[PDB]
């Protein structure tokens, strides 16, 4: 009975932290197995009724930090929104937490890369993980955002 379907680009980031693209009803039975307390949602669009009923049924808190989905070379990742998401991500009371965007590549990739910088990973190691998810859609601007991200306020 091969029946569980993780959401698009699903991965475990760390103890209590997951990343993916946008979950749909086919992914709900899999997400139930994780015992989520929180979702960090990085798109501005309203959450669909299907997903809201999943959250309500499972007692999952929704944190929305809407980042516009821009394309290179006109990408302007908002530092403030990433930092608000990081503040929630670093509070273990919110774990287990799923970070998701639409595809789990750009917005999700930036938030995870900034977590890795706080975890003292080498930039080349952060970029390698970012590229594994983003694949042919890897953006230099996402990696430059991580390069210049000042960790001072979170250490």
Interface residue list for ligand HPS (CB under 6 A): 69, 101-108, 137
Q: Return d(Cα 65, Cα 129) in angstroms, integer.
A: 22
Q: Which is nearer to ligand HPS, 94 or 109 (CB)?
A: 109
Left, alpha or beta for 2 (phi > 0: left; psi -120 to 50: alpha)? beta
Q: Which is nearer to ligand HPS, 32 or 102 (CB)?
A: 102
Residue 103 beta carbon to ligand HPS: minimum distance, rounded to whole angstroms? 4
Residue 31 beta carbon to ligand HPS: minimum distance, rounded to whole angstroms? 17
Residue 111 beta carbon to ligand HPS: minimum distance, rounded to whole angstroms? 9
Q: Which is nearer to ligand HPS, 32 or 66 (CB)?
A: 66
| DSSP designation for 47 | P
Q: Return d(Cα 61, Cα 58) in angstroms, integer.
A: 9
Residue 122 beta carbon to ligand HPS: minimum distance, rounded to whole angstroms? 23
Q: Return d(Cα 63, Cα 98) in angstroms, integer.
A: 10
């Amino acid at each position: 009975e091969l029946h569980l379907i993780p959401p698009l680009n699903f991965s475990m980031v760390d103890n209590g932290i997951f990343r993916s693209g946008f979950p749909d009803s086919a992914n709900f039975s899999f997400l139930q197995t994780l015992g989520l307390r929180s979702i960090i949602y990085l798109c501005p669009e309203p959450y669909p009724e299907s997903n809201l009923q999943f959250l309500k049924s499972n007692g999952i808190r929704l944190f929305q930090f809407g980042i516009e989905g821009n394309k290179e070379p006109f990408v302007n990742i908002p530092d403030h929104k990433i930092r608000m998401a990081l503040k929630v991500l670093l509070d273990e009371k919110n774990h287990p937490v799923l970070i998701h965007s639409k595809r789990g590549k750009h917005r999700t990739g930036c938030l995870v890369g900034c977590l890795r910088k706080l975890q003292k990973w080498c930039l080349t190691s952060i970029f390698d993980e970012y590229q594994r998810f983003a694949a042919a859609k890897a953006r230099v601007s996402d990696q430059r955002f991580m390069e210049i991200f000042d960790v001072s306020s979170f250490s």
